[PDB]
Design a protein around this ligand. Sequence first.
Ligand SMILES: Cc1cc2nc3c(=O)[nH]c(=O)nc-3n(C[C@H](O)[C@H](O)[C@H](O)COP(=O)(O)O)c2cc1C
Length: 379
Amino acid sequence: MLKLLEPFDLNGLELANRMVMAPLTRNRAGPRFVPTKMNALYYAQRSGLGLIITEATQISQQGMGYPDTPGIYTDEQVDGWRMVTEAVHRREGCIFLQLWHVGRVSHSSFQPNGQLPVAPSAIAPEGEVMTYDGIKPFETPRALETEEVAHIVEDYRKAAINAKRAGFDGIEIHSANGYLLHEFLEDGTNKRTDRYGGSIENRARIVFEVLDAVCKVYPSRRVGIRLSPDTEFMSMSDSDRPALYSYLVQELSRRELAYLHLIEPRIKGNVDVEKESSLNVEFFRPLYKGVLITAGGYQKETGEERLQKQHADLVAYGRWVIANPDLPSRFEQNAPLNPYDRATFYGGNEKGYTDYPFLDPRDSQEALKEAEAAERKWR
Ligand SMILES: Cc1cc2nc3c(=O)[nH]c(=O)nc-3n(C[C@H](O)[C@H](O)[C@H](O)COP(=O)(O)O)c2cc1C
């Protein structure tokens, strides 16, 4: 009787339920940003979620701002992701790769040749950024030349080519949470005078060009996109978020994409914030035609209310899913939720990653089995 637990049809994909694993950076790639068997166990374990969206995956070295995130720009990376897609599919799961460019939220230490991070405009985020050599202040990033936006779009297109080859069911363009695309959208970050700055239309141009480029690799019904309609995460700010997001959503409505993925203002990236905003999901449901994913601070009961009230079609869970590989079964049988441990979110090993327990140990055995089979197959 939970709507969260109703199978849902995603323009062809037979989702087990209406619950989504939110994208989650775990900082556990192998050398050269290549996914490993351990990574496949983790996704295999969580494959009773209707849809998995992966951790943000950089489309290029230039797009990375945190250590040991996986990439999707080399063959060796694609091979690694194949273990992941295989294992999730053997468990009858569905999965999309979230494509990432960190923008200015990076450090020369991460960059090819120790070049500056790139952004719309030469404006550093506030605060400090973890690097290979400990905590350092954010640097002023380099403002991208007009001509270079084309080359970033092409990175996304190559990245989607690699994704399709890796065997992902679809892709999600990360346009949220303070990163390259988001910096383009908001006029607090975007001070450009060319055809990608100024007018609301112009700021979104890049988002539309990325979408044009990837929908040449995947059918548009397999391209998703994530927005953060109203957040301070990473020194974001816009002079008029209602106006900017209204336009951006209505345009998106007409591109017949797989879904729109909206993060609730009560999330500041990875933590909860007290915050007044009307730019939550209720405000966008009217403005977006197709399949709508709501994410951010939900529980069983508040997620269920979203679906009953027809506010969204899918509810994403991030932190609960880190801790509860079988969240849907727990919801379903009214079980206690395993607590999540923030200290093991980022970096590390099995601990706080693949060692959260299931209701049913057999689920656990089946994930291990598929993940080992996936490794032998793609050895
Ligand atoms: C450890 C951690 C990693 C995350 N990584 C990503 C990411 O890679 N991409 C993204 O778009 N959001 C990311 N988020 C934001 C979450 O996807 C989600 O919006 C947030 O956790 C709020 O959802 P929740 O309340 O269910 O946890 C992350 C959050 C956490 C706590």
